Amino acid sequence: EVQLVESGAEVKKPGASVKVSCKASGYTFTSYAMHWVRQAPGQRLEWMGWINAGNGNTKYSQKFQDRVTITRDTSASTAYMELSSLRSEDTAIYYCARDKVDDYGDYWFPTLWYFDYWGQGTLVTVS
Amino acid sequence: ALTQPASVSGSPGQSITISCTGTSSDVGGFNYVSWFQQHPGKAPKLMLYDVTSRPSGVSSRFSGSKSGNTASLTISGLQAEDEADYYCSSHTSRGTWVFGGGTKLTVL
Amino acid sequence: AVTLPSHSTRKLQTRSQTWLESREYTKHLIRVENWIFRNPGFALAAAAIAWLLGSSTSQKVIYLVMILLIAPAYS
Amino acid sequence: AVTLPSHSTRKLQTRSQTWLESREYTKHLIRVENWIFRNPGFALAAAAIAWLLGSSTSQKVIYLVMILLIAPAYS
Amino acid sequence: IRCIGVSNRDFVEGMSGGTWVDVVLEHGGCVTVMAQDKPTVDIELVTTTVSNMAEVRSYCYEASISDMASDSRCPTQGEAYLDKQSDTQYVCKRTLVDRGWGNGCGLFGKGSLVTCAKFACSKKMTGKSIQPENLEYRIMLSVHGSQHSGDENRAKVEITPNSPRAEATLGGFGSLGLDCEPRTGLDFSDLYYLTMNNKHWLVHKEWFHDIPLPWHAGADTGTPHWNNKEALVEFKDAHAKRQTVVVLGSQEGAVHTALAGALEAEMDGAKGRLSSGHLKCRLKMDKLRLKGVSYSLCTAAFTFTKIPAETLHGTVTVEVQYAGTDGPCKVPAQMAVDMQTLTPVGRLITANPVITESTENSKMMLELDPPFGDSYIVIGVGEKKITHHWHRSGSTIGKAFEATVRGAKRMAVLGDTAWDFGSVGGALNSLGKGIHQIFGAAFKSLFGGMSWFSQILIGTLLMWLGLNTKNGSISLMCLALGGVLIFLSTA
Amino acid sequence: WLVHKEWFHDIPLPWHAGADTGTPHWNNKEALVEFKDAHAKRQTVVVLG
Amino acid sequence: ASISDMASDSRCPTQGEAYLDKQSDTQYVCKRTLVDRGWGNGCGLFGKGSLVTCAKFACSKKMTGKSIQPENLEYRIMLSVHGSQHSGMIVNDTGHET
Amino acid sequence: ASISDMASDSRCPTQGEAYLDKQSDTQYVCKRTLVDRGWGNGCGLFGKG
């Protein structure tokens, strides 16, 4: 059924930039918005932003407003998240979660069940 | 951003409650309250959305409540396969998502 | 150019708002009021010209208003 | 924005020509002629409303002309 | 569902043919259809996209002039000649200039001066033609009943002039037929699709053909040949001996203010979606069944999960939770006063409400149309029936007045098609529609070139005129006034 | 251009006033931005051209 | 003008009014309106809620006026005399001081 | 209420209008008026600044 699979784990030195994909399967990719959530080791989850795969609008959190760029590839059914200027704090696991987009094609209000399906995770190690 | 207890423990067979205190912009005003269960290794699983409401393939033991600025997840009949991390999340008024600190439940 | 016909003539009628809907009433009222405020003496000129036209009182007041409207637009 | 008062009100009078001097008269005439050509039935409506106003013939003709000028500008 | 909180939804209660009911769908609101023995269906028009539009008459709103040149001849010589005059890329202007005895040409007449300058565009705002084909409406359907507060209960129908009628298959409820009129929706073939720079509008044909700017018809490629070649170029005259050429700047905010009353639109890819319109579908509800009937009543205890909220139109939404496990079973729900004698008062605009799942705790959402007094929502059979207190504000007179106001606004927005909202069909409806067509054609011919300033003015003028004209035309002028001024104050 | 007073004061555009020091401060700001309310649900902001 | 990062804030039918932290910034244009809300959207009540939208305003093109006092205006009057000048020196501007 | 460090700005009779850099701050109450100025105060003109 619904399956979100991310790229494998990656190790990067500080100052570099990571790009992690999230391939979606089992549903219409164009009618869903993809959120990216980072979890530090044994800490709270951190919402980073979302991208509306339909038209392409994005919204990032204030904490990552000028460090993260999320893009998508509909034909390949993939959502990429790129984080630049890595720091030692950025050593964490990155998950992708779907959410249904309104029938008008906009993503103003999210649906009650936001993160019904998640990705398995991808460890980014900042050394 | 959401105040959650560090850990909660209970013997198998009894009920327990995990609270989640927020502000008047995320938990106080909206029914946008969700509870996720995460076993170690696996990704989080949506246990409750819409405060009380819960998905299809979820045991009816999990219940949700909300009073003022505090939401609460209640597990009656604590089973074995319940030792995991429980996170509360809320969609703020400004259109952003906030998660809870995290609660490690131990069935002993 | 200079003319640029307005589309409010052919206003598309629907449930949703049109392009610049909130601005129409204030648009015309502001134009008229500003011209009259900058040039007050033409109130007297138009009053005289309306009085010399039209038999009854209501005809004269209608002439006054129509002159005071047709002047700020130079229509 | 939308109003942007025209400067021809305060036209600077000199020997030399002003900014856009070749376009003023044709400007207003073109606006009026275009609007009347697009909406012909209002000629009938204005003729009727002018006929119902004003005693003499001259007052009715002046009412007709002032309506046909005040309508294209929505002044 | 999908209609509850919309605040511009209308109820089409009633079906006098046991069959199809006509309904006019609009982008703003949605329609809940409730028949005798059929489930309440919520219908909404969601998007209308236009695709592969042909290109017509691009305009140039930001020009630029490249290289100026000029020529003069002494007063009694031929005319000033520039080789660039026969070049159709150059704007050329000819005038008279003071010459003689100082400029090396011995005579004191006026001489001829020619100035030519190369024309180069920028931006090229473009309009496109919307044909009846390549246009598509999307209609979303939902069905009341077992649905939770948050598919076999919802459907999506695409309607294009190639396939005007469709059937939405709602599993277990049967199938709802929509026989629709796509071609006569918003009277395209008078509207063009205009873009300036990543902003798109729906615009009238005549407005677009009456706009003074350099233009060229057809699709663009390479360096086009711009027409008119002025209204962007000004040949100003110096102290009777020179000519200067300037361009007017960028003409874009002037067009933005000229486009007042034109509809916005948003384009993704080649397809551009409109956000306002209307359509008219006839609903064949002759294969709609009731999933619930022939279920035994639920015998357990219900709880109120949240509350019985009140929608804007007075209906109550109740979300209940079921504790027993009886399988699919009817929900006994009613609106009552005097708990002693439970007499059903009001109407339940929900199905013979049913719980679908068979688990410990299930959830349900049903909506009710209560009476104007105080009442109690009674859910359950006996000795376990939960009840909630509920108070409704209005009165039947206020309800009828608001219904007349809504009908008047619908008429102001939808002309004659307004008569097709409950168009089950008689002879009074068709007569009203015919005379409305006639009066609307006459009104659009006479008035309808005016926009809330011209209309308010001429309405007040006709008001006074009909007040004092002292004839049988008094009523005529007062009715024409009322039409105009209501069309205005609808807003 | 040479312009008359009272044509340069009756203009509906966002205006600073005199001293330009740092990050400018435009006084009007509602004559170049249009807030279109979509259908019930949202709001969008555009600028005039 | 040029516009920039928009943001918005919404509240349930029976609450206060929406407030963005970027309303206390004199570089943002903000507008407040009413929006359909309730239950589905995720807030439980059905009235009209309140929505605020703000966008950052920047000017890429500017236009300036300057005041002219009737002092410090200089006029240049050119004078010539008949008599000995030949036709050539009609439109010649050169060292006229000599 | 409580008020705090007041400040002011002024312009010669024929200049623009006074502008304090703290008018771009939404924590300050600001008011603009006209003052008699000239030729004694250090502005050579005699109108109202």
Coordinates of C-alpha atoms in Angstrom, one line a residue, chain E residues 29-385:
Chain E
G29 CA -21.1 27.4 -2.3
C30 CA -22.4 23.9 -2.3
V31 CA -25.8 22.1 -2.5
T32 CA -27.3 19.4 -0.2
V33 CA -29.9 17.4 -1.9
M34 CA -32.4 15.6 0.4
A35 CA -35.2 13.5 -1.2
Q36 CA -37.9 11.3 0.3
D37 CA -36.3 7.9 0.4
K38 CA -32.8 8.7 -0.6
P39 CA -29.7 9.7 1.3
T40 CA -28.6 13.3 1.6
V41 CA -25.9 14.0 -1.0
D42 CA -23.6 17.0 -0.9
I43 CA -22.5 18.3 -4.3
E44 CA -19.9 21.0 -4.9
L45 CA -18.2 22.5 -8.0
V46 CA -14.5 22.5 -7.2
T47 CA -12.3 23.5 -10.2
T48 CA -12.7 24.4 -13.8
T49 CA -9.5 24.2 -15.8
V50 CA -8.9 25.5 -19.3
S51 CA -6.2 23.9 -21.5
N52 CA -4.4 24.3 -24.8
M53 CA -5.9 27.8 -25.5
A54 CA -5.1 29.4 -28.8
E55 CA -3.2 32.6 -28.9
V56 CA -4.7 35.9 -30.1
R57 CA -3.4 39.4 -30.3
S58 CA -0.5 39.9 -27.9
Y59 CA -0.1 43.5 -26.7
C60 CA 3.1 45.4 -25.8
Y61 CA 3.0 47.2 -22.6
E62 CA 6.7 48.1 -22.2
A63 CA 8.4 49.5 -25.2
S64 CA 12.0 50.6 -25.8
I65 CA 13.5 52.8 -28.5
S66 CA 16.9 51.9 -29.9
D67 CA 18.6 54.5 -32.1
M68 CA 17.2 57.9 -33.2
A69 CA 18.0 59.7 -36.4
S70 CA 16.7 62.8 -38.1
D71 CA 16.9 64.9 -41.3
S72 CA 16.1 68.5 -42.3
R73 CA 15.9 70.3 -45.6
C74 CA 16.0 74.0 -46.2
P75 CA 12.6 75.7 -46.7
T76 CA 12.2 75.3 -50.4
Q77 CA 13.5 71.7 -51.1
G78 CA 11.6 68.5 -51.2
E79 CA 10.8 66.7 -48.0
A80 CA 13.1 65.3 -45.4
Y81 CA 14.0 61.7 -46.3
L82 CA 15.3 58.9 -44.1
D83 CA 16.1 55.5 -45.6
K84 CA 14.7 54.0 -42.4
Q85 CA 11.2 55.3 -43.2
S86 CA 10.3 52.2 -45.3
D87 CA 11.5 50.0 -42.5
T88 CA 8.5 48.8 -40.6
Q89 CA 10.4 48.5 -37.3
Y90 CA 10.9 52.2 -37.0
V91 CA 8.5 54.9 -35.7
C92 CA 8.9 58.0 -37.9
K93 CA 7.5 61.5 -37.3
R94 CA 7.5 64.4 -39.7
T95 CA 7.1 68.1 -38.6
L96 CA 8.1 71.6 -39.5
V97 CA 11.1 73.5 -38.1
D98 CA 12.4 77.0 -38.2
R99 CA 15.2 77.3 -40.7
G100 CA 17.2 79.9 -42.5
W101 CA 20.4 82.0 -42.9
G102 CA 21.8 80.7 -39.6
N103 CA 21.5 77.0 -40.4
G104 CA 23.4 77.4 -43.6
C105 CA 20.3 77.2 -45.8
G106 CA 19.4 80.5 -47.4
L107 CA 15.7 81.1 -47.2
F108 CA 13.3 81.8 -44.3
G109 CA 10.5 79.4 -44.7
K110 CA 9.6 76.5 -42.5
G111 CA 11.6 73.3 -43.3
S112 CA 10.7 69.7 -42.9
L113 CA 12.1 67.5 -40.2
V114 CA 11.9 63.7 -40.0
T115 CA 12.9 61.6 -37.0
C116 CA 12.9 57.9 -37.0
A117 CA 13.6 55.5 -34.1
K118 CA 13.7 51.7 -33.8
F119 CA 11.0 50.0 -31.9
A120 CA 11.6 47.1 -29.5
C121 CA 9.0 45.6 -27.2
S122 CA 9.1 43.9 -23.8
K123 CA 6.6 41.9 -21.7
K124 CA 4.0 41.4 -24.6
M125 CA 0.9 40.7 -22.5
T126 CA -1.1 38.1 -24.3
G127 CA -4.7 37.1 -24.7
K128 CA -6.0 33.7 -25.6
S129 CA -9.3 32.3 -26.9
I130 CA -11.4 29.9 -24.8
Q131 CA -13.3 27.5 -27.0
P132 CA -16.1 25.3 -25.7
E133 CA -13.9 22.3 -26.0
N134 CA -10.7 21.9 -23.9
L135 CA -12.8 23.1 -20.9
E136 CA -13.4 20.8 -17.9
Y137 CA -15.3 21.0 -14.6
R138 CA -14.7 18.9 -11.5
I139 CA -17.5 18.1 -9.2
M140 CA -17.0 16.6 -5.7
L141 CA -19.8 14.5 -4.1
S142 CA -20.1 13.3 -0.6
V143 CA -22.9 11.3 1.1
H144 CA -24.3 11.8 4.6
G145 CA -24.6 8.9 7.0
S146 CA -21.9 6.8 8.5
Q147 CA -19.1 9.2 7.9
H148 CA -16.9 10.1 10.8
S149 CA -16.3 13.8 11.7
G150 CA -13.0 13.7 9.8
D151 CA -13.9 5.8 -0.1
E152 CA -17.4 4.6 -1.2
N153 CA -18.8 7.6 0.6
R154 CA -17.3 10.2 -1.7
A155 CA -16.8 10.6 -5.5
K156 CA -15.3 12.8 -8.1
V157 CA -16.9 13.5 -11.4
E158 CA -15.2 15.2 -14.4
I159 CA -17.6 16.9 -16.8
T160 CA -16.4 18.2 -20.2
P161 CA -18.5 19.2 -23.3
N162 CA -17.3 16.0 -24.8
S163 CA -18.9 14.0 -22.0
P164 CA -21.6 16.3 -20.5
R165 CA -23.3 13.5 -18.4
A166 CA -21.7 11.1 -16.0
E167 CA -22.6 8.7 -13.2
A168 CA -20.9 8.7 -9.8
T169 CA -20.9 5.2 -8.3
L170 CA -21.3 5.4 -4.5
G171 CA -20.8 1.8 -3.3
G172 CA -23.8 0.6 -1.4
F173 CA -25.8 3.7 -2.0
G174 CA -26.1 3.0 -5.8
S175 CA -25.2 5.6 -8.3
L176 CA -26.1 9.3 -8.8
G177 CA -26.5 10.5 -12.4
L178 CA -25.6 14.0 -13.4
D179 CA -26.8 15.3 -16.8
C180 CA -25.1 18.6 -17.1
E181 CA -24.8 21.6 -19.5
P182 CA -21.1 22.5 -19.7
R183 CA -21.3 24.7 -22.8
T184 CA -23.8 27.3 -21.4
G185 CA -22.0 27.6 -18.1
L186 CA -20.4 31.1 -17.9
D187 CA -20.8 32.2 -21.6
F188 CA -17.2 31.7 -22.7
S189 CA -16.6 32.6 -26.4
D190 CA -17.0 36.1 -25.0
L191 CA -14.1 35.7 -22.6
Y192 CA -10.4 35.7 -23.2
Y193 CA -7.6 34.3 -21.0
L194 CA -5.1 37.1 -20.4
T195 CA -1.6 36.9 -19.0
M196 CA 0.8 39.7 -18.3
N197 CA 3.7 38.3 -16.2
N198 CA 2.8 35.1 -14.3
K199 CA -0.6 36.7 -13.5
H200 CA -3.7 35.5 -15.4
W201 CA -7.2 36.9 -15.8
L202 CA -10.5 36.1 -17.4
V203 CA -11.3 39.2 -19.5
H204 CA -14.0 40.3 -21.9
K205 CA -13.6 40.1 -25.7
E206 CA -14.6 43.8 -26.2
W207 CA -12.4 45.2 -23.5
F208 CA -9.4 43.3 -24.9
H209 CA -10.1 44.5 -28.5
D210 CA -10.6 48.1 -27.4
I211 CA -7.3 48.6 -25.5
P212 CA -4.9 51.1 -27.2
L213 CA -1.3 49.6 -27.3
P214 CA 1.0 48.2 -29.9
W215 CA -0.3 44.8 -30.8
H216 CA 0.1 41.8 -33.1
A217 CA -2.3 39.0 -33.8
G218 CA -1.4 35.3 -33.7
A219 CA 1.2 33.4 -31.9
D220 CA 4.6 35.1 -31.4
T221 CA 8.0 33.8 -32.5
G222 CA 11.3 35.6 -33.2
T223 CA 11.0 39.4 -33.6
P224 CA 7.4 40.2 -34.2
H225 CA 6.0 43.1 -36.3
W226 CA 4.3 45.4 -33.9
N227 CA 1.2 47.3 -35.1
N228 CA 0.2 50.9 -34.5
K229 CA 3.7 51.6 -33.2
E230 CA 2.5 54.4 -31.0
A231 CA 0.7 55.1 -27.7
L232 CA 4.1 54.0 -26.4
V233 CA 6.2 56.6 -28.4
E234 CA 6.0 60.4 -28.0
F235 CA 7.6 62.8 -30.4
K236 CA 8.0 65.9 -28.4
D237 CA 9.1 69.2 -30.0
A238 CA 11.9 71.3 -28.8
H239 CA 12.5 75.1 -29.3
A240 CA 11.1 75.0 -32.9
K241 CA 14.3 73.5 -34.2
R242 CA 14.6 69.9 -32.8
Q243 CA 12.5 66.8 -32.2
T244 CA 13.0 64.3 -29.3
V245 CA 11.6 60.8 -29.0
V246 CA 10.6 59.2 -25.7
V247 CA 8.8 56.1 -24.6
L248 CA 6.0 55.9 -22.0
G249 CA 6.9 53.8 -19.1
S250 CA 5.8 50.2 -18.7
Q251 CA 2.1 50.7 -18.9
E252 CA 1.5 47.8 -16.5
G253 CA -0.1 49.4 -13.5
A254 CA -2.4 51.3 -15.9
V255 CA -3.6 48.0 -17.2
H256 CA -3.9 46.6 -13.7
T257 CA -6.3 49.4 -12.8
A258 CA -8.0 49.0 -16.2
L259 CA -8.7 45.4 -15.3
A260 CA -11.2 46.2 -12.6
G261 CA -14.1 43.7 -12.8
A262 CA -12.1 41.0 -14.5
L263 CA -11.8 37.6 -12.9
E264 CA -8.5 36.3 -11.5
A265 CA -7.2 32.9 -12.5
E266 CA -4.2 30.8 -11.7
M267 CA -2.3 28.7 -14.2
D268 CA -0.2 25.6 -13.4
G269 CA 1.4 24.1 -16.5
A270 CA -0.5 24.7 -19.7
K271 CA -3.8 24.4 -17.8
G272 CA -5.2 27.4 -16.1
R273 CA -7.8 27.0 -13.3
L274 CA -10.5 29.5 -12.8
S275 CA -11.8 30.2 -9.3
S276 CA -15.2 31.5 -10.1
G277 CA -18.0 30.3 -12.5
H278 CA -21.1 28.3 -12.5
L279 CA -22.7 25.2 -14.0
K280 CA -26.1 23.6 -14.2
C281 CA -26.6 19.9 -13.7
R282 CA -29.7 17.8 -13.4
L283 CA -29.5 15.1 -10.8
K284 CA -31.0 11.7 -11.7
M285 CA -31.5 10.1 -8.2
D286 CA -33.3 7.0 -9.4
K287 CA -30.5 4.6 -8.7
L288 CA -29.8 6.0 -5.2
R289 CA -30.6 3.5 -2.5
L290 CA -30.4 3.6 1.3
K291 CA -27.6 1.5 2.7
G292 CA -29.0 1.4 6.2
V293 CA -32.6 0.3 6.1
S294 CA -33.2 -3.4 7.2
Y295 CA -30.8 -2.9 10.0
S296 CA -31.9 -3.6 13.6
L297 CA -31.6 -0.7 16.0
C298 CA -28.5 -0.4 18.1
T299 CA -29.1 -1.4 21.7
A300 CA -26.2 0.0 23.7
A301 CA -25.1 3.3 25.2
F302 CA -23.9 6.4 23.2
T303 CA -21.6 9.1 24.3
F304 CA -21.2 12.7 23.0
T305 CA -17.6 12.9 21.8
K306 CA -17.4 16.7 21.4
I307 CA -20.7 18.6 21.5
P308 CA -23.7 19.3 19.2
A309 CA -22.2 22.3 17.4
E310 CA -24.5 24.7 15.5
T311 CA -23.8 25.6 11.8
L312 CA -24.5 29.0 10.4
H313 CA -27.8 28.0 8.9
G314 CA -29.2 26.6 12.1
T315 CA -28.6 22.9 11.7
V316 CA -26.9 20.9 14.5
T317 CA -23.9 18.6 14.0
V318 CA -23.7 15.8 16.6
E319 CA -20.8 13.4 16.9
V320 CA -21.6 10.3 18.8
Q321 CA -19.5 7.3 20.0
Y322 CA -21.0 3.8 20.3
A323 CA -19.9 1.4 23.0
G324 CA -21.7 -1.8 22.1
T325 CA -20.8 -4.3 19.4
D326 CA -24.1 -5.0 17.4
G327 CA -22.6 -4.7 14.0
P328 CA -24.2 -2.3 11.4
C329 CA -27.3 -1.0 13.2
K330 CA -29.6 2.0 13.0
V331 CA -28.9 4.9 15.3
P332 CA -32.1 6.0 17.1
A333 CA -31.9 9.8 17.1
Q334 CA -34.5 12.5 17.4
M335 CA -35.3 16.0 18.4
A336 CA -37.8 16.2 21.2
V337 CA -39.4 18.3 23.9
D338 CA -41.3 16.9 26.9
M339 CA -39.2 13.9 27.7
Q340 CA -42.4 12.3 29.1
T341 CA -44.0 12.0 25.7
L342 CA -41.2 11.7 23.2
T343 CA -42.9 13.3 20.2
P344 CA -40.5 13.9 17.3
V345 CA -40.3 17.6 16.6
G346 CA -38.1 19.0 13.8
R347 CA -36.5 17.3 11.0
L348 CA -33.3 15.2 10.8
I349 CA -31.3 16.1 7.8
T350 CA -29.2 12.9 7.9
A351 CA -30.0 9.4 6.8
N352 CA -31.6 6.7 8.9
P353 CA -28.3 7.2 10.7
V354 CA -26.2 4.0 10.9
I355 CA -23.0 2.8 12.5
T356 CA -21.0 0.9 10.0
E357 CA -18.1 -0.8 11.9
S358 CA -18.5 -3.6 14.4
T359 CA -15.9 -2.9 17.1
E360 CA -16.0 -1.8 20.7
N361 CA -16.1 2.0 20.3
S362 CA -17.2 3.5 16.9
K363 CA -17.9 7.1 15.9
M364 CA -20.7 8.7 14.0
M365 CA -21.6 12.2 12.8
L366 CA -25.2 13.2 12.0
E367 CA -26.8 16.6 11.4
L368 CA -30.3 17.7 12.5
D369 CA -32.7 20.5 11.6
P370 CA -34.2 21.4 14.9
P371 CA -37.3 23.4 15.7
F372 CA -37.0 27.1 16.6
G373 CA -37.8 26.6 20.3
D374 CA -35.6 25.0 22.9
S375 CA -35.3 21.2 22.5
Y376 CA -33.4 18.1 23.4
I377 CA -31.3 15.9 21.2
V378 CA -32.4 12.4 22.3
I379 CA -30.1 9.5 21.3
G380 CA -30.6 6.0 22.4
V381 CA -33.6 3.8 23.1
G382 CA -34.4 3.7 26.8
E383 CA -32.8 4.3 30.2
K384 CA -29.5 4.8 28.4
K385 CA -30.5 7.5 26.0

